[PDB]
Nucleic acid binder design. Structure first.
Lengths: 78, 93, 107, 95, 93, 107, 78, 95
DNA sequence: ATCACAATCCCGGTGCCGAGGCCGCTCAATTGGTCGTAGACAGCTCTAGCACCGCTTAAACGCACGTACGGATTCCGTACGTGCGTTTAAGCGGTGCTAGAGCTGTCTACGACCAATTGAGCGGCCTCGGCACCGGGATTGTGAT
DNA sequence: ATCACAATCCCGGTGCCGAGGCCGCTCAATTGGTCGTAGACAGCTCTAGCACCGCTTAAACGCACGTACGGAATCCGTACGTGCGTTTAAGCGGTGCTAGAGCTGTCTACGACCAATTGAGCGGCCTCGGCACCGGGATTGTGAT
């Protein structure tokens, strides 16, 4: 499923970041970085879900997880 | 199920600063998140100040000090003016 | 008894002093909350909202728009050094980024 | 007509820095989120907004990282980003 | 003026893990700061969890969840074991 | 009445359950505190202290010292990936740094 | 008083940081960085002092200021 | 006998990375602290431990910054730290 | 430069859907009264912060000199960007099914609170052993030769 | 390489001061009882999450080709490091003075709390205007020539 993050998608993210030229080894590196980030946030979000005795991860669970990792997100109920 | 929000107050303030300007639901959600976030930051700092000074009451003095510690530069200067003016007007009803 | 006068109207504010007082009392911040604390906090919240909304409305008008969207809020916050510092670790959903290209990349 | 290498790249920078839309396809991203969450808890459901919140945060994080990675490349007198630039940015950020 | 600290308990634990090892006053101050810091982190997270779930009581469940969120890797695994063992022993007096 | 038995001894702990309970009740964390919460928290604090002290005592013995100093605590925390992560944004006074020279700087 | 932070002192700090060679313009740059850092911490520490209605900045005031700027210090009462 | 440039520098790294003592002279640092605080409040007194706490934090901060500055220099294929390295480290750190 | 030309931009001309206002009602804010205690204030006590002075070396400084490092230059192959034809699957709309989120009522065990008792934990004190340091000899890496 | 040699390290041999233990006492934890409500639990309701299918283009992909960028090699002057003699002032110890930190007692105004009243703020609904978008023409930068 990590391959679903295609080279064109990674290129678009780099373009928004102001990147003009990209090495061929960046795509695999980016996939690894994104996986680590997602794992960290999802782990905490699921912890909140289990504490609420819920079977559904809510947007609030994600917002709380981001907040505690110092990546506060505005627009999803906090 | 009623879910309280600051939407009505954000709209009132918007109509004062920009009478002909509206706001999208997405932008309203950002504003609601912003107010809640700043509230938490100020109240949490005021709570710490009270505890550090062995006080059991959060007063306007604790809020003022929290504002000076959190808001940067002129944001703090003007926010303190607004808060002081409001308390003065309220005490004279 | 006398006609009900809201604490917000007594303080000349649009933000709710009564609600802010309840949120302070039930937010596990302290044992007691002074009468002036909610008034002061409400005024500060109102001032900050006015500042962002005024700057966001200007950005909307510059984009020939009559409604503020997350993009306009992001433009207002990132183009102001103080607001950017206050909201440094904050992500505005659907806000995008500031157009910025390093000079060495230019033709 | 053939645009010189770099011209279309700069045109894409201008276009994506002006837009606010999500740049990762939604369905593949959703599959990744569900696959990652399976290792923490089985039979997990997800609110549509939960997946959207995750996507917004991830894209913001990666764009921010690409900005710092670019600065590292320019610092080494290069215009091309390489894994060593990503590694330095993350190390300095504390990641 | 009496100022409470965890010095006595840190020394008791030190004598269990290292019977012939002592500790300097500076090192004791570091340990006191450490205990106070971790206490705040756990209690503050437990407070947030209770508020998020509209609960008025911080119980061993809130502490356990806070430990999982704050302590990294095997630190959390072993800390949870210790906490669970202590609660079980306490409930059987 | 019965002879006084401390909650710490009931939980088999060296850390003070009664003091931890009071600090939770007077720390503005919640309206109420369960009976097991202080027991659980005290055990976790005790476990973490034991871990650091054991690793610090080993560092002291490696330095032919019989007393733990801030240097030994810094060595124990920075040489352990998990303890280093937990105390990432923490400065140990008089702790110094880990001996580390980049390979490219070597003769 | 900023000149009291001498070149040898800055060199010692760089040596602990594992630095082998130092440019001559680093000393003035370091002095500027240190000044900004100190100003930020002292500003907050004095704010705590004024709130306590004290005329003496305490170690606790400094510890609190460092804590809120994400630079927690152990060894000085917290 | 003359040691080659770099030999004594590496010897100093080994010595200071093994020690934990403060590297800034105490009296000059105290004067700087008092001079900076004067702009915030006049007639300010300072606990001896307050000045010591400030010194410990400042030295830790500068040593940490010099570590990241060194990584930036090595990244640009240099063994010498320059202001551009300090600037990059601080920018990436968010300072 | 001059001209093709390829991509973006700007502007009318329409669909459409969500901003925005209204309506009914209820639940949370306001009015009024009542009482307990948090905190301001005044006075006192004594800690420790400041000021200063006289030495005494360690550190800082200023300079001389040499060389290794930084940067400019040069060259060259290939890893990138760009373009195009072909395949893939995201997105959209639509439909159906059901887990589980959210809520309400009930009832009880648990936590707060209070009085009485008591023992751990605090400061104060005091004193030997760990350690800092001095000196001297061995060890060992560095560099000229 | 071989040897000087300069710096570090390792190890006894002592001063000394703070770790460490003890002692008296008090204040905070424990015991016991009492009562109100938070929350667990059971049941119900219906929201929205999941599954899936059939198209329909936009996006992705695979490859061909050219060239600009990355990196390796080259050279050279000067900005660094190292060393040494000279100056400066940090550090230490000692002494004296006093601001102000910390504490205690007192007393009152303020905040909690409770009952009664009431009006702002919530969902539900509904509907026009802002805006997204389509298309077409102008604008404009890019590149061969």
């Amino acid at each position: 499923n990590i391959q679903g993050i295609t080279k064109p998608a990674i290129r678009r993210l780099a373009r928004r970041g102001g990147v003009k030229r990209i090495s061929g080894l960046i795509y695999e590196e980016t996939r690894g970085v994104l996986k680590v980030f997602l794992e960290n946030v999802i782990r905490d979000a699921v912890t909140y879900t289990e504490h609420a005795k819920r079977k559904t991860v809510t947007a609030m669970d994600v917002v709380y997880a981001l907040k505690r990792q110092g990546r506060t997100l505005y627009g999803f109920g906090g | 199920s009623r879910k309280e929000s600051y939407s009505i107050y954000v709209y009132k303030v918007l109509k004062q600063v920009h009478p002909d300007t509206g706001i999208s639901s997405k932008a309203m959600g950002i504003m609601n998140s912003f107010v809640n976030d700043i509230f938490e930051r100020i109240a949490g700092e005021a709570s710490r100040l009270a505890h550090y000074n062995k006080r059991s009451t959060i007063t306007s003095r604790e809020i003022q000090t929290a504002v000076r510690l959190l808001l940067p530069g002129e944001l703090a200067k003007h926010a303190v003016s607004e808060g002081t003016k409001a308390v003065t007007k309220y005490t004279s009803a | 008894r006398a006609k009900a006068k809201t604490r917000s109207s007594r303080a000349g504010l649009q933000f709710p002093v009564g609600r802010v007082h309840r949120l302070l009392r039930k937010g596990n911040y302290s044992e007691r909350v002074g009468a002036g604390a909610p008034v002061y906090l409400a005024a500060v919240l109102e001032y900050l909202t006015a500042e962002i909304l005024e700057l966001a409305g200007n950005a909307a008008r510059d984009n020939k728009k009559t409604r503020i969207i997350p993009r306009h809020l992001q433009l207002a916050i990132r183009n102001d050094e103080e607001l950017n510092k206050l909201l440094g670790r904050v992500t505005i959903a659907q806000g995008g980024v500031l157009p910025n290209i390093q000079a060495v990349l230019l033709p | 007509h053939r645009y010189r290498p770099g011209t279309v790249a700069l045109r894409e920078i201008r276009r994506y820095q002006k837009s606010t839309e999500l740049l990762i396809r939604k369905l593949p991203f959703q599959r990744l989120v569900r696959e990652i969450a399976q290792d923490f808890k089985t039979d997990l459901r997800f609110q549509s907004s939960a997946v959207m919140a995750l996507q917004e945060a991830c894209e913001a994080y990666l764009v921010g990282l690409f900005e710092d990675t670019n600065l590292c490349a320019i610092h080494a007198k290069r215009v091309t980003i390489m894994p060593k630039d990503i590694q330095l940015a993350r190390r300095i950020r504390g990641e």
